[PDB]
Amino acid sequence: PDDRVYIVRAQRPTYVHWAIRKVAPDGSAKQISLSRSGIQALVALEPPEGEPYMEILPSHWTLAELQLGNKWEYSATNNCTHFVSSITGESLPNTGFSMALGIGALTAI
């Protein structure tokens, strides 16, 4: 019940990565966003990366965690901003796609 959950923002070289992070009382953290396996984008845990942008509800974590391993169809109009916004209801600037790299910008697992 003491877990805190945030939208986090990580500036990457070609685009802005958005994620959801859960921080435990002991300061350990988990983070979910979009990654890829080869050419397949997907929802995945990732190392905590980036700066807290906005605190949100614990229930938002559950929504993200329930999507782990789902496929994602990655595009200019469907990227990490949309993943986070669809969970949280928060508007984020559509900064979350790399025109130069497209899906290549996502971290490989």
Swiss-Prot record:
Domain LRAT: 7-95
Disulfide partners: none
Subunit relationships: Homodimer. Interacts with protein 2B. Interacts with protein 2C.
Function field: Required for viral RNA replication. Does not have any proteolytic activity.
Protein name, UniProt field: Protein 2A
Organism: Aichi virus (strain Human/A846/88/1989)
Covered residues, full protein: 1027 to 1135 of 2432
